Write a protein that binds this ligand. Structure first.
Ligand SMILES: *[C@@H]1O[C@H](CO)[C@@H](O[C@@H]2O[C@H](CO)[C@@H](O)[C@H](O)[C@H]2NC(C)=O)[C@H](O)[C@H]1NC(C)=O
Ligand SMILES: *[C@@H]1O[C@H](CO)[C@@H](O[C@@H]2O[C@H](CO)[C@@H](O)[C@H](O)[C@H]2NC(C)=O)[C@H](O)[C@H]1NC(C)=O
Ligand SMILES: *[C@@H]1O[C@H](CO)[C@@H](O)[C@H](O)[C@H]1NC(C)=O
Ligand SMILES: *[C@@H]1O[C@H](CO)[C@@H](O)[C@H](O)[C@H]1NC(C)=O
Ligand SMILES: *[C@@H]1O[C@H](CO)[C@@H](O)[C@H](O)[C@H]1NC(C)=O
Ligand SMILES: *[C@@H]1O[C@H](CO)[C@@H](O)[C@H](O)[C@H]1NC(C)=O
Lengths: 895, 895
């Protein structure tokens, strides 16, 4: 009991604002029970259980209301799981639910979740304040009212003029008390929870007493219709005062004299007056009867279904139905959902005290889920126990006029009906104070967060971290709810924002799990990404079922703040401008890429090309750029690399020429790529600073496309020829792919197009998925469109049949069967150059005239004295072919 | 006349499909008039002008219909401008409107515009086919029908069973004729346009004749209500056959005997029968009268407004209103808009013949705009001339039963009413043939385009480039329209897709102008980007006014194909996977950046940091990485660069260690950056391959943050010390900014946080916006939060007052006034080291104990013998300060 009372000395249900965020940057105990569960359980129980639940039980029945509760509950339990994965991730920063969402989903969604929830909570201030004024005018003080109806038809207008003149009278009282008396209202958090849960138990007490003996609450009927028990007290058409039968006051309101003359309406005279039991209790058979629907229309008299009546009097000449019971408004299914829904909102109060718990990764998930479960078990068992204990004709009655102006709920209370009427009053007064505290701290947090700059003046707090300007704005948005002055119309507008916040909380947690954003570790047990997606579609549907023409103005206001933060998100970090909106998406996509493996399933060539630029700078071989567009036509990353010699301190105007000749040239041949002009000491280094440092992030170059040294055996170019030899060993170590083009100047540019073409591919042993795919990418292009693919295979085994039967089943698996297959078969440098000249005879004698020849490029020797052991081997390999492309690679897979 | 008839030998209104796209890749005259204008003018005039316009004129009046036409017209004229900017851009490829949109907006939107337009046109096939069957059962052959009403109440059911049994009977006839007889229906394009425009002129002929003498079309009334003139011929209650007055057949349908006994309904007997003129003409005063609204309800008898009647008989005991004129359906404003809208669709037929025009950048814009203008001028002047010439009670009449079963339009025809009835029949038959040709060529184009892979089997054309499988699918989507069997319900579903296509065509052209996508040159005269945006919101609103619960199923089907193409767009080019969806957005954002200038308005430091990694590799100074997070905290690009020595062929396992030590370290201090580990010959080169080649695209590094050589005067490190000196001259030439950190090991890491801190800034002459902003970024961080900013200025002039009054007005402009200001003032190497030791005395004697000191770093000498002329100058400058950061930069501006 000791940790109870000491914890009850701590227990306050208020959010932790930015003053509690200051104590987190400068650097007690709680529990699961008084920390999350009891704050959340208070902020869900509200006015709708007491003031408008029984009105929904009788109208929609119990079979449609059970389906109605189970779809409004099931959104909250799924968006608690999306509040759970935010809790398990992160370190749960001290201060509010705003800082828990904003830090774990970035400032992108946090300014939009935090701002829908500001307006959604401010209308919960004005809705509860209309809840208190309605109780004050119907049950507590139904005498005191300024505006009174000047006729029998002014009940529509004078009632709404009551709700405007007391709301604005009390909203100024509510705003000042939370302003000056913050320390007092901090103390009464246990009073308000005591008033609620006793009032809920007082219902469940009296439902058990009514099973054994129901109370005395009779109702009076007149044919099928009932009548207001306001003016008269006794229900009889004739008062039998002994030997003198007297006209009652029931006679007086209908018949236009209190005399025995019988000069009145024919519907009163032909129909008798019946007084039966209005609350027959749990022993009664109501559940088989009161089950389906009673969807009335505004003006229709509420009529008991199963009574014998007399069918006449088509008009309604009863002094505007002076003594009867009516329907206030027309009603249907998808209107009540806007009224029921704010009874299930308050999950975000589950983490008002995250900076005081000790196990915040376990209290915040398990606490709200248990709080939703104990609340939905009340709601569902309230709906049935309202149905099977109370006659439906008073359940269709707002304001309890059929039971002589007492609360429809409060007549089911065992001690007294003044218990719930007072008990729901200090409840709804208290959740009005809480809503004028939880909302001004929130706008205080967003304003000091700097996340949206035009809301900057609302950060001006007072001396103790309490606001002064957000109160005056939240007093003027509660003000708009009070001018509407109608509990049934504030409720769908209020519901439209709390649906919108739970729309985003399910949205961002489903996206960031799928795309694998950085720093996203939902370490929760019972979680998936579809489970946030399923709740995302569900409270998309509820948002239109309320009112579709308000759901579009709710999205496109929230969808425009989400884009307004990003346009200010760019202009702070990325310098300025609409360029920064593209810089950030460039950065954020690259940081996404850092997790996955490179080799995953599939291979595509991503070209690194490197050109030679001479003196009076320009490219020497534009046909090499012309090849690049013929493979990777309007596709992945292209890096046009180039080098030149020495002293960047005075060589950069040459770099300006060198880059600009390439930029206008890629546009000339439709290459969408990126230029790198590097100034090195020798060309040996400057090529190797691009084979390993081209393309940051995941967008690495994957192949290297290079020409051929044509000035091979000449004066000094040997070391430039030696730079080619170090390039081959480099790509094997770095695990790239090499593409070597021979006779570069005679290549098909984009004017020349070929016809009757044949490409001849010689796939001997190695490089399967790259030597096969390279013509298939080329043929795909319009220049190489009208061409033929020929694949010739060298063999070294004995059988060729199964060798072809192994080869012919590759194409069926590759789905590119259109190539024709033909089999062929037959100190250290000479053995290399024995088979060189022999095979090159076999190459030409079946492929003298192709438009392009493909060959395997073998591995260079590790000796490094193999300049002449290996390169005459390749010039014999290029035995006077017109266009041959050499290829080798390492460590890849092609599907 | 010669180019007419020869052009009339060419004039065919069919789209150019993929066979016309083959003739563009292998590689006559037209004009504006027969090329764009007349094809577009045919495919807008349809069934709605003849069959359901007059029904809308009488119901919605002429004041609401004029506002109705002017908002459905104004969407088409704005989406023609968005079709104009697609035309002026590009080269206008041969073949259809699909290839014009797909190439100019990429395969992203082209598969979604091209697929909404496929379904939007297929229902235009089934709508027109219901238009022909309705004319065939009401005017031409109203005798032949299989299903006939078994009672007076079967007219609802038997009519819809007529439309199902003839539609599917004729849809098989429509599908085969376009299959086998493509050459025949190619010839009749001039017949169908001749049938339309003569029928439109036959209306405007007879409206002029009716002004001088209206024809004879009388109608019969009975009190306020009219009656069907079907069975009887003469309108009198008593046939006066001489001396024997006889009961008419008008008597026979009402009164239940053709005898003179008068045994019948009291509404017939108390009310007289009036036969007035049903079409009073242009001379009549109808326009002041027939103006407002007549929104009826299903079952209500159409009643003339201004007639004297007799008010009795509450029920309708007239053998289910056997002889009367009714309303087929309930109606309101936002239901008729779904019926009127397909009268204005057909813009995409403006470029069916783009591959045959000569000036395709001028014919396509000016042709469709003139085609919309001449069509809207018909529609608006048809609405008024229908109102002010025809009595409203037959305008509320479908099927023309009040005028004895003749067309409400066709009675305004001057030669004969059989002109329009035949003329609108060969029109609507012809636009049904055209819709079963324009739609199967379209799905043939998307299937061969490979843009969506599950639609691949629909590319199987026949031998002459004509489809065979897209016809059977478009016969089965017309089939669903025929089972609905109702012209009033196919029309909003048909309207929902053509609105969706014009939604995207306005969308993509407004986006790609704003973001400046590559290759987007709208060279059109009268164009802006808001003018596409204004039309985008307008046919967003029309899409909900039709039916909101169909607009959400129209977007989220089109919005899901747009994301399905991209997930196949990634898995083709970027290897595979959901990584490729991020690679493409990374590439596409960088290619956007290539246009704009760098220096635009604002400056932010984008750090290039470079570290020293020793033997048994690890970073030597982790405190330098600790500084990076304290400036650019969770913000722009960070490049952690590193070098090591020699022979990448065998040095890459050292590179694996070198990169991995940095990756776990940036996470340890919350740095979101990118690693580059470069292996060079000397460290002189390998630093300079990062100062100019770090960060492709727009995301360049903008500053360089570097430590300090502490082993200054020692054994061999002179040349490594000389590598620092070449780094300073390099950044001045490359126009970067330099940040030099002194005493690197004693820096505040993220555990240690400071209090009572002072940062002392010495801004002497140069580097304004960088030396001011650098503490302001630091203070912003939590470690440097509780600190003070002190700015001390060295002076060389005489006055200091106005010098402070120039300095104190900077802070008011910078809004960072919180710093305190204090003024101070007072072979070749010695003059540099005279003022060095003098100023460094002045530095320390006001700033002995700051947490960080900022100083201007001067320019190095061009002599290059200034190793000792300049670096003792800096070590005297660092006169035993704890933490000082040196800074200089070039060519920037800070706002
Ligand atoms: C209550 O009684 C009346 C007659 O006493 C029932 O009959 C209906 O009366 C209205 C007149 O307001 C008529 O329009 C309906 O056609 C009557 N319905 C019939 C004859 O079936 C009325 O239904 C009763 N109310 C109930 C059962 O809820
Ligand atoms: C046509 O005549 C009738 C009476 O002959 C007009 O009067 C209405 O009659 C209906 C009965 O179906 C009543 O429900 C309405 O209350 C009557 N309206 C009155 C009396 O104003 C009827 O308005 C006439 N139709 C017109 C003018 O369009
Ligand atoms: C109505 O009844 C009263 C009896 O209370 C009588 O005084 C009065 O005269 C009667 N009025 C008549 C019969 O008009
Ligand atoms: C009302 O009920 C009583 C039974 O006490 C009966 O005598 C009377 O006739 C009824 N009146 C009616 C049906 O109008
Ligand atoms: C109705 O009038 C006819 C005259 O055509 C007459 O033959 C018949 O007897 C009459 N029926 C009566 C009066 O019931
Ligand atoms: C119908 O009009 C005629 C005028 O020819 C008149 O004699 C007759 O009384 C009218 N009938 C009515 C108003 O029922």
């Amino acid at each position: 009991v000791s940790s109870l009372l000491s914890g009850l000395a701590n227990y306050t249900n208020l959010p932790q604002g930015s003053r509690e965020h200051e104590e987190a940057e400068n650097n007690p105990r709680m529990g699961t029970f008084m920390g999350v569960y009891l704050p959340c359980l208070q902020n869900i129980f509200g006015v709708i259980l007491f003031l408008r639940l029984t009105w929904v039980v009788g109208i929609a029945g119990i079979m449609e209301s059970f389906c109605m509760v189970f779809i409004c509950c099931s959104c909250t339990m799924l968006t608690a799981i999306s509040m759970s994965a935010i809790a398990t991730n992160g370190v749960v920063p001290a201060g509010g639910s705003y800082y828990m969402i904003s830090r774990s989903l970035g400032p992108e969604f946090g300014g939009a979740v935090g701002l829908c929830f500001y307006l959604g909570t401010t209308f919960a201030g004005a809705m509860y304040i209309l809840g208190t004024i309605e109780i004050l005018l119907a049950y507590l003080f139904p005498a005191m009212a300024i505006f009174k109806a000047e006729d029998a038809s002014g009940e529509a207008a004078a009632m709404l003029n009551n709700m405007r003149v007391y709301g604005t009278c009390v909203l100024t009282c509510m705003a000042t008390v939370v302003f000056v008396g913050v320390k007092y209202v901090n103390k009464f958090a246990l009073v308000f929870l005591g008033c609620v849960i006793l009032s809920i138990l007082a219902i469940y007490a009296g439902v058990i007493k009514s099973a054994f003996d129901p109370p005395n609450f009779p109702i009076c009927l007149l044919g099928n219709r009932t009548l207001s028990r306001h003016g008269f007290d006794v229900c009889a058409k004739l008062a039998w005062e002994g030997n003198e039968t007297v006209t009652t006051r029931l006679w007086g309101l209908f018949c236009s004299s209190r005399f025995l003359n019988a000069t009145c309406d024919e519907y009163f005279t032909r129909n008798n007056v019946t007084e039966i039991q209005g609350i027959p209790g749990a022993a009664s058979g109501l559940i088989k009867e009161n089950l389906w629907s009673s969807y009335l229309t505004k003006g229709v008299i509420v009529e008991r279904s199963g009574m014998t009546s007399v069918g006449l009097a088509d008009g309604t000449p009863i002094d505007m139905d002076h003594p009867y019971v009516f329907s206030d408004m027309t009603s249907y299914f998808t209107l009540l959902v806007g009224i029921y829904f704010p009874s299930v909102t308050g999950i975000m109060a589950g983490s008002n005290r995250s900076g005081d718990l000790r196990d915040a990764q376990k209290s915040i998930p398990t606490g709200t889920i248990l709080a939703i479960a104990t609340t939905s078990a009340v709601y569902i068992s309230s709906v049935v126990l309202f149905g099977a204990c109370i006659e439906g004709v008073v359940l269709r009655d707002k304001f309890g006029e059929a039971v002589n102006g007492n609360l429809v709920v409060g007549t089911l209370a065992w001690p007294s009906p003044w218990v719930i009427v007072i008990g729901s009053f200090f409840s709804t007064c208290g959740a009005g104070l809480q809503s004028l505290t939880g909302a001004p701290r929130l706008l205080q947090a967003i304003s000091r967060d700097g996340i949206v700059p035009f809301l900057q003046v609302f950060g001006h707090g007072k001396a103790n971290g309490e606001p002064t300007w957000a109160l005056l704005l939240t007093a003027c948005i509660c003000e708009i709810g009070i001018l509407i002055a109608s509990l049934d119309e504030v409720a769908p507008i209020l519901s439209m924002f709390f649906l919108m916040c739970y729309m985003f909380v399910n949205l961002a947690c489903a996206v960031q799990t799928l795309l694998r954003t950085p720093n996203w570790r939902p370490r929760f047990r019972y979680y998936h990404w579809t489970l946030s997606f399923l709740g995302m579609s569900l409270c998309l549907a509820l948002m239109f079922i309320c009112s579709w023409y308000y759901a579009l103005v709710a999205m496109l206001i929230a969808g425009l703040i989400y884009k307004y933060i990003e346009y200010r998100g760019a202009e702070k970090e990325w310098g300025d401008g609409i360029r920064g909106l593209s810089l950030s998406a460039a950065r954020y996509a690259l940081l996404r890429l850092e997790e996955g493996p490179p080799h995953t399933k599939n291979w595509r060539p991503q070209l690194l090309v490197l050109v030679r630029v001479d003196q009076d700078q320009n490219v020497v071989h534009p046909q090499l750029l012309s090849l690049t567009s013929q493979l990777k036509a309007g596709k992945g990353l292209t890096i046009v690399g180039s080098v030149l010699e020495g002293t960047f301190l005075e060589n950069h105007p040459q770099a300006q020429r060198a880059e600009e000749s390439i930029r206008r040239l890629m546009e000339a041949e439709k290459v969408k790529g990126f230029c790198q002009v590097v100034i090195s000491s020798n060309l040996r280094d400057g090529v190797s600073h691009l084979i390993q440092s081209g393309g940051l992030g995941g967008l690495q170059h994957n192949t290297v496309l290079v020409g051929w040294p044509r000035n091979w055996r000449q004066k000094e170019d040997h070391q430039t020829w030696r730079n080619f030899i170090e390039l081959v060993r480099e790509t094997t170590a770095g695990h790239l792919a090499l593409l070597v083009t021979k006779n570069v100047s005679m290549f098909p540019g984009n004017p020349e197009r070929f016809s009757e073409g044949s490409i001849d591919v010689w796939w001997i042993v190695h490089d399967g998925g790259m030597l096969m795919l390279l013509p298939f990418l080329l043929r795909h292009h319009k220049v190489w469109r009208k061409c033929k693919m020929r694949i010739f295979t060298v063999a070294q085994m004995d059988d060729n049949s199964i060798q072809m039967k192994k080869d012919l089943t590759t194409f069926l698996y590759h789905l590119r069967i259109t190539a024709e297959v033909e089999v062929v078969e037959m100190q250290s440098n000479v053995r290399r150059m024995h088979t060189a000249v022999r095979l090159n005879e076999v190459i030409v004698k079946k492929s003298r005239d192709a438009k392009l020849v493909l060959l395997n490029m073998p591995g260079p020797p590790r000796n490094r004295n193999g300049d002449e052991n290996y390169m005459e081997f390749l010039e014999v390999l290029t035995e006077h072919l017109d266009r041959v492309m050499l290829v080798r690679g390492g460590g890849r897979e092609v599907i």
